[PDB]
Amino acid sequence: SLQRIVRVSLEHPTSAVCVAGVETLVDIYGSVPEGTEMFEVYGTPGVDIYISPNMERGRERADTRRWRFDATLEIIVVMNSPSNDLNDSHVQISYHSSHEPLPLAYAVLYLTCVDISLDCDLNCEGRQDKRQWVWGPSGYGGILLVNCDQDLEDMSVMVLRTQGPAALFDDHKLVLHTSSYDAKRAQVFHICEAYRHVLGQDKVSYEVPRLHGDEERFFVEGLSFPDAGFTGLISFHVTLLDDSNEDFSASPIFTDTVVFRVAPWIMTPSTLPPLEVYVCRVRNNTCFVDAVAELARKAGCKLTICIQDEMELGYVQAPHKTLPVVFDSRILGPDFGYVTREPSFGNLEVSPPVVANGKEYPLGRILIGGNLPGSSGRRVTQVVRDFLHAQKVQPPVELFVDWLAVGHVDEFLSFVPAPDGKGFRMLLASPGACFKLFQEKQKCGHGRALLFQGVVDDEQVKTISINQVLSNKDLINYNKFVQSCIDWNREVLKRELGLAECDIIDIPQLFKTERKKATAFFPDLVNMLVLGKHLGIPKPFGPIINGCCCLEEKVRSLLEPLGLHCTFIDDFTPYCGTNVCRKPFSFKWWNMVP
Amino acid sequence: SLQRIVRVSLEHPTSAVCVAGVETLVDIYGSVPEGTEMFEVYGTPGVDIYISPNMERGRERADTRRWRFDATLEIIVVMNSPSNDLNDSHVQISYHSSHEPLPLAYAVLYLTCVDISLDCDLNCEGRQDKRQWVWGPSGYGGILLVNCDQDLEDMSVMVLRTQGPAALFDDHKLVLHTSSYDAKRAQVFHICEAYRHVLGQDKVSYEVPRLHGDEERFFVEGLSFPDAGFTGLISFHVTLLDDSNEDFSASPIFTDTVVFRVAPWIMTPSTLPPLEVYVCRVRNNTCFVDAVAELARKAGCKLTICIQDEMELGYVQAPHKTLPVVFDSRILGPDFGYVTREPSFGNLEVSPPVVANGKEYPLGRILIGGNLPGSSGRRVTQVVRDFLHAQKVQPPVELFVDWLAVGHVDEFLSFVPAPDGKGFRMLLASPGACFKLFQEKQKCGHGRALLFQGVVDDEQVKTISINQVLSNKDLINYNKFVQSCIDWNREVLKRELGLAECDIIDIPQLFKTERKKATAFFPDLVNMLVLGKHLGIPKPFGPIINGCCCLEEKVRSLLEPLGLHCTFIDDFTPYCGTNVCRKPFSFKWWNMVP
């Protein structure tokens, strides 16, 4: 870089304000004396004086010798140290002729150095520039955590450094201002019950008292997540204004900016480590809550309370803290946030970190269960997907779920830790894996094995044999249909998540029809609970061969090789929902480069 | 890239639809015969059959020999040519054992190839990819021209290519769909009084009749420019849906997309060639309209009509046509468009093509006359700047105009053609250039020269001499103030427009005070009309030395060297506005890479 032109007169002295480190360039207002041929420049000790050709970029110290007068030359004055008193430094230019021993004329410029800096804390990824927000491993910006759609220890502090003569500000004003747009989505408090609401919704500008010496503290709070019309960027400026020309108008001296970005909302994948599990109270299903308790104690801690698929759990994060957030449509509350968008799929849908089509998704991708084109009803896209695309960090992919009676993505999809490959496996429900399994068992002579023999060990509940299933032509054809439905999604996922067949495990799962749409013929295996290396799998109640549920043995043969532990939980045995909280990524969202 | 999984059965044949060029991959539903060791694949002539390892990327033709059975292998079937009739082609897989001479079992898949393509016209900059919108010299997208905030020859045509058996579409449906968001800002007509409004504001989906044979034409019209909440992108999709499983649900086969971008609004710089000039009728100022007519005939054509600064003139452009557009707050109309944003500076403000801070601005930058921080009033930023930033193509810079009574950017700023350097010069009003000039004339003995001697040659209107001006201390100090005001803007422009001093010309201009704010002491020279190499300059009525307005002679000495022709027009002599239309850039906006 920033430069500034201050113009001096031969007739009388000039008075000016230097901002610490900014280059003031000094020109003359009007003409230079008669017969001028040379000039000298001189300054008090703290004033750095340079010359430069106005074409070339370099600078040279000027106070040491006498220069041939060239209009093309530039005088540049900088002051790095604030002034103690007004006009305690000065610059003198003298013009000279070879004939006349003495200066033709003097031009004197008294200066007052003030240091003004508006600042936050960004990051040291590529420390050192402009006031904008740089994504990436070599970028920088301020972060704002949004709490809601003491009061805030999760607040973002803003500091104004003002060093210089006190009296300077009898005459000069410090404005803190923002945009109307930026004001609607953020608010600032000045420290200065004690914290005073200076910049806010109607409030756009604010004269700074300078009630607290050298530095003036502020606390910023972001009120809105990035929406369809909001990029998540908030700028604040400070401006030094000159209001000494009582007859003239007020004029700007200097401006500084700080740019904040609102932290996006990030979904947690069922491959992240678990922290706490939300289970909704069941007077009826004691044993199931016991089993989930045992699982949690197998992995971590588990809280229970009087739905789960009604809301989603994610997090926001800044360098200082990460904050759990809940997306909805009343709360836990302590150490929690809330996001609500009002205009109902709501279910759990996010992938692990992946690489696809050259692009890289370090935080994974959000899987939105779509609604088939040309359909009267809308299922998930209730243009909150607005909000999810606006997050920018987990680009979503649409999936095909219209064929299910319920229509949840987790009904046929699961992501599980893997010790090799890409570190995870994708589990897909597969009627056809079950078909193959039943045929293999049939050819071994176990065609008479009875599904639902554990369920109907004591309460007769319509058992079926492998043979009866395999020869029910209608059931087989319907399951071929839903297998093809799942195939479509499989190929979509394989594309958008750059997955290979070797990364995918087909889980034997049958289906039947409720109102011409898919439901689970036997408990949906893939509707897992994934807590690190421990799995809460709906016990299938499949055919008992040699006193074992061959379905369970299959799932084990598939998953135990990967170090997983399969605990088959009795979800369907007795005639609310399930959800969990997870620790964030090791990866930091601001290091992504969309 | 796209792939698709079609599953076949040993029990009975399978029927499927191939989209032309898409890879169908063929697997078996359930298990493979007993003792299977080998397999062969075969197809009718138009069916290309390949094998691939599911790990590796290559493909190999498969119909020529007998393969060792490996579950890891992939069968891939493609059909590049549409089918004449249903199921007129097929694929047969046979499984084999070394012991048994004959195929253990067959799996047969009858196919119907249909070619479905949704298409527009993008560009041949880097022809050849994905359906998205690529900026740059090696990019592509569809363009939509917005006419308003026969019916349209400036319409964007959309084509659906459907080749294949007619009967196929008794059973299968073609949906044309868009987003609700995209629907609000665009509408489509199907040809198909004759053109039928199929996709529109409430309309999101549309079954395609196929009333017109192989290809179905559509005409798209963009209704909204890119705003704060609109990026200018509009996507349309076609989807082939299978609705033959009357008992099951409908399922997707294939989807295609075409992406349009709304063309931004581009301001025309006063260095572009002129086309037509808008002059508002003046019963009083005959001679001035005569003079502007003479200027236009010096350069081009000029129309006159019964303000100019009330609106702005720009253009939108697509590969087929460019359309003049007028931004407002009734019209010319034929070959014209209109943009209006409702919630008043309105004046003329745009720079020429420039390079700054590494970034490149091929179409120039928009100069927004800002309002000083913390001021009750808003002058230009009435959050239509929303709209101007949203255009994305001419990033705007804020300037300081609060010191003027009127406050127009053109009051002190002008861009003029230059034959060298950067091809243009920036002209700035400069009290100080005038100061220097008056001093030089004073030292030559012409201190008695009378300003306003032409104006007051016959009507005595308070003439001033050079000497009287120079010694009016108050006037000089005020003009030093406004010179510093202009200095600030000069440095801003020099930064944001990467300009050098050698690119700037200071034009001698004095000022006086109207209600503590700047107005022209003598007619504002820099408030030019720039028509190619011809200039309509307010005649200054400056001091007559040797029967010449020394101000005019100065302006000539500055501008004539650059090939310019200065015609001093009598704007202020007798006791509405001015505007012009310009030919677009040679540069094309879609070749910029913001």
HEC per residue, B432-488: CHHHHHHHHHHHCCCCCCEECCCCCCCCCCCCEEHHHHHHCHHHHHHHHHHHHHHHH
**Alpha-carbon distance B173 to B559, whole Å?**
69
Helix/strand/coil (H, E, C) string of A352-380? CCEEECCEEECCCCCEEEECCCCCCCCCC
With beta carbons less than 8 A apart as the criterion, state whether B165 and B84 touch: yes
Query: Chain A partners of B173 at a C-beta cutoff of 8 Å?
Result: 374
What are the phi and psi torsion angles at A120 (to 5°)?
-130, -155
Joined together, the tokens standing for residue A448 give 């008479």
b/e string for A66-79 if b means 16 or more Cβ within 10 A?
eeebeeeebbbbbb
* Packing angle of the helix pair B473-496, B433-443 (nearest 10 deg): 130
8 Å CB contact of B435 and A30: yes
Does B173 contact A374 at a Cβ distance shorter than 8 Å?
A: yes
The whole-angstrom separation of Cα A257 and Cα A263 is 19
A423 residue type, one letter: G
> Residue B148 contacts by C-beta under 8 Å, 6 or more apart in sequence?
B223, B337, B338
Residue B240: which H helix or E strand, with range?
strand B233-242
Q: How far apart are CA A581 and CA A273, in angstroms?
A: 9
Taking an 8 Å cut-off on Cβ atoms, the answer to whether B516 and A181 are in contact is no
Catalytic residues of B: 576
Query: Which pair of structure tokens corresponds to residue B253?
Result: 């086969």
Closest CA to B294 of B455, B531, B524: B531
Which residues are CB-neighbours of B132 under 8 A, at least 6 positions away?
B141, B259
CA-to-CA separations, A498 to A270, A352, A417, A426, B43, in angstroms, rounded:
18, 12, 17, 12, 30
Residues 6+ apart with CB under 8 A from A354: A361, A364, A365, A422, A497, A498, A499
Residues 6+ away with beta carbon under 8 Å from A412? A404, A428, A429, A486, A489, A509, A526
Q: How many CB atoms lie within 10 A of CB A461?
A: 12
Exposure b/e, B29-60, CB count within 10 A at least 16 = b: bbbbbeeeebbbbebeebbbbbbbeeeeeebe
> Closest-CA residue in chain B for A6?
B484
How far apart are the C-alpha atoms of B235 and B188, rounded to whole Å?
A: 12
Q: Is-contact B417 B352, C-beta < 8 A?
A: no
Shortest Cα–Cα distance, A5 to chain B (Å): 6
Measured in residues, chain A has a length of 594
Distance CA A361, CA A393 (A): 8
* Residue B347 to residue B369: CA distance in whole angstroms: 9
Q: What are phi and psi of A151, to 5 degrees?
A: -55, -40
Q: Residue for token digits 């987790």?
A: A410
- Spatial distance between the Cα atoms of B51 and A366, rounded to a whole number of angstroms: 33
Q: Considering only alpha carbons, which residue of chain B is nearest residue A378? A: B180
Rounded to whole angstroms, the Cα distance separating A245 from A268 reads 59
Give the separation between CA B76 and CA A341, rounded to whole angstroms.
45
**B469 alpha-carbon distance from chain centroid:** 49
User: Which residues on B lie below 8 Å from A422 (Cβ)?
Assistant: none
**CA-to-CA distance for A36 and A10, rounded, in angstroms?**
13
DSSP string, A503-546: GEEEEE--EEEETTEEEESS--TTS-EEETTEEEEE-----BSS
Distance, in Å, from the CA atom of B218 to the CA atom of B336, rounded to the nearest integer, reads: 24
- Give SS3 for A176: strand
β-sheet bridge partners, residue B477: none
Q: Is B47:B89 a contact under the CB 8 Å cutoff?
A: yes
List beta partners, residue B519.
Answer: B512
DSSP per residue over A392-444, as a string? -SS--EEEE-TTBSS--GGGTEEEEE-SSTTSEEEEEEETTHHHHHHHHHHHT
CA-CA distance, A351 to A497, in Å (whole number)?
A: 8
Give me the catalytic one of A287, A306, A576, A581. Answer: A576
DSSP-assigned letters across all residues of B361-391: ETT---EEEE--TT-S--SS-SS-HHHHHHT
Whether the CB-CB separation of A451 and A470 falls below 8 Å is answered with: no
Q: Tell me the CA end-to-end span of chain B in Å, nearest whole number.
A: 29
Question: Is residue B451 within 8 Å of residue B465, measured between CB atoms?
Answer: yes
Distance between CA atoms of A39 and A72, rounded to whole angstroms? 13
The resolution of the experimental structure, rounded to one decimal in Å, is: 2.8
In this structure, what token pair is assigned to residue B308? 């100019």
Maximal CA-CA distance, chain B: 124
Judge contact between A264 and A589, C-beta under 8 A.
yes
d(CA A413, CA B147): 47
Rounded to whole angstroms, the Cα distance separating B527 from B309 reads 13
Tokens 């026969």 belong to residue: B150
Q: Report how far apart, in Å, the C-alpha atoms of A374 and of each of A492, B177, B205 are.
A: 20, 7, 5
Chain B: nearest CA to A292, how far in angstroms? 34
Compute the nearest-CA separation of A555 from chain B (Å): 17
| Contact residues on chain B for A478, CB-CB shorter than 8 A | 248
Contact state of A516 with B247 under an 8 Å Cβ cutoff: yes
Q: How far apart are the first and last CA of chain A?
A: 29
3 state SS of A297: helix
Question: How many beta carbons lie within 10 A of that of residue A295, not counting itself?
Answer: 21
Residues counted in chain B:
594
| DSSP 8-state assignment for residue B549 | B
Q: Sign of dihedral through CA atoms B452, B454, B457, B458?
A: negative
Q: How far apart are CA B200 and CA B219, in angstroms?
A: 12
CA distance B48 to B81: 11
Chain centroid, CA B338 distance in Å: 15
Question: Token pair of B479, please?
Answer: 């003009």
DSSP A215-259: EEEEEEEE-----TT--SEEEEEEEEEE---SSS--EEEEEEEEE
Rounded to whole angstroms, how far apart are CA atoms B373 and A255?
10
Question: In 3-state terms, what secondary structure has residue B557?
Answer: helix
DSSP secondary structure, A48-69, as one string? EEEEEESSS---EE-TTS-EEP
Q: Judge contact between B133 and B259, C-beta under 8 A.
A: yes
Which pair of tokens denotes residue B232?
Answer: 């200018």
Residue A372 burial (10 A CB sphere; 0-12, 13-18, 19+): buried
Whether A335 contacts A326, CB under 8 Å: no
Type of residue numbered A584: P
Question: What DSSP letter does each residue of B221-235 carry, written as one string?
Answer: EE-----TT--SEEE
CA angle A222, A228, A231 (to 5 degrees): 50
Whole-Å CA distances, A356 to A310, A360, A365, A494: 31, 6, 11, 9
Set of chain B residues whose Cβ sits within 8 Å of the Cβ of A251: 372, 400, 403, 481, 484-485, 488
Q: Cα angle vertex A498, ends A263, B236, to 5°? A: 75
CA atoms within 13 Å, Cβ hemisphere of B344: 5
- Exposure class string for A482-516: b at 16+ Cβ within 10 A, else e: bbbbbbbbbebbbebbbbeeebbbbbbbbbebeee
CB B73 within 8 A of CB B40: no
Phi, psi for residue B549 in degrees, rounded to 5: -70, 100
- Cα–Cα dist A423/A269, whole Å: 13
Residue among B184, B153, B447, B181 at smallest CA distance from B321: B153
β-pairing verdict for A215-222 and A186-190: antiparallel
DSSP per residue over A76-131, as a string? EEE--S--SSTT-EEEEEEEE-SS-SS-SEEEEEEEEEEEEEEE----SSS----S
Q: How far apart are CA A362 and CA A586, in angstroms?
A: 10
Residue B146 burial class via C-beta count within 10 angstroms: exposed 0-12, middle 13-18, buried 19 and up = buried
Of the candidates B415, B361, B432, the residue with the CA atom closest to the CA atom of residue B589: B361
In terms of CA atoms, which chain A residue is nearest residue B375? A205
Phi, psi of B9 (to 5 degrees): -120, 145
DSSP state of B579: E
Element (H, E) at A385: helix A385-390
- Torsions phi, psi for B562 (to 5 deg): -90, 15
Backbone angles phi, psi at A497, to 5 degrees: -110, 15
> What is the amino acid identity at position A354?
V
Distance CA A51, CA A58 (A): 9
Listed residue (A530, A507, A529) closest to A520, CA to CA:
A507
| Short-list A578, A438, A571, A450, CA closest to A508 | A438
The residue assigned the tokens 């935080």 is A363
- On chain A, the residues whose CB falls within 8 A of the CB of B249 are 402-403, 516-517
Sort A588 into a burial class: Cβ within 10 Å, 0-12 / 13-18 / 19+: middle
A129: CB partners within 8 A, 6+ apart: A140
CB A175 within 8 A of CB B373: yes
Radius of gyration in angstroms for the set of CA atoms belonging to chain B, rounded to a whole number? 35
Domains in chain A, ordered, with CATH? 1-119 (2.60.40.1860), 120-262 (2.60.40.1700), 263-594 (3.75.10.10)
Q: How much of chain A is helix, strand and coil, in % rounded to 5?
A: 15, 35, 50
Alpha-carbon span A311 to A31, nearest angstrom: 74
Using an 8 Å Cβ cutoff, are A121 and A319 in contact?
Answer: yes
Q: Which tokens go with A193?
A: 């019950």
Check CB contact under 8 Å for B180 and A383.
yes
Going by the DSSP 8-state scheme, the letter that residue B248 receives in this structure is S
Q: What are phi and psi of A393, to 5 degrees?
A: -100, -25
- Taking 3-state DSSP, the helix, strand and coil percentages for chain B, each rounded to the nearest 5, stand at 15, 35, 50
Helices (H), B201-352: 286-299
Q: Give yes or no for a contact between A258 and A130, defined as CB atoms under 8 angstroms apart.
A: no
CB pairs under 8 A between A and B: 167
The alpha carbon of residue B305 is apart from the nearest alpha carbon of chain A, in Å, by 38
Q: Could you give the CA distance from residue A273 to residue A435 in angstroms, rounded to a whole number?
A: 34
Closest to B262 measured CA to CA, from B126, B392, B127, B382: B392
Return d(Cα B567, Cα B574) in angstroms, integer. 18
C-alpha span between A343 and B102 (Å, rounded)? 64
**E strand or H helix at A338:** strand A337-340
3-class state of residue B241 by DSSP: strand
CA distance B479 to B431: 6
Cβ neighbours of residue B28 under 8 Å, at least 6 residues apart? B7, B8, B9, B10, B93, B107
CB environment B335-373: b (16+ within 10 A), e (fewer): eebbbebeeebbbbbbbbbbebeeeebbbbbbbbbbbbb
Q: Do A251 and B34 touch (CB under 8 A)?
A: no
The tokens describing B138, both together, are 């090696």
Residue A68: phi, psi to the nearest 5?
A: -60, 130
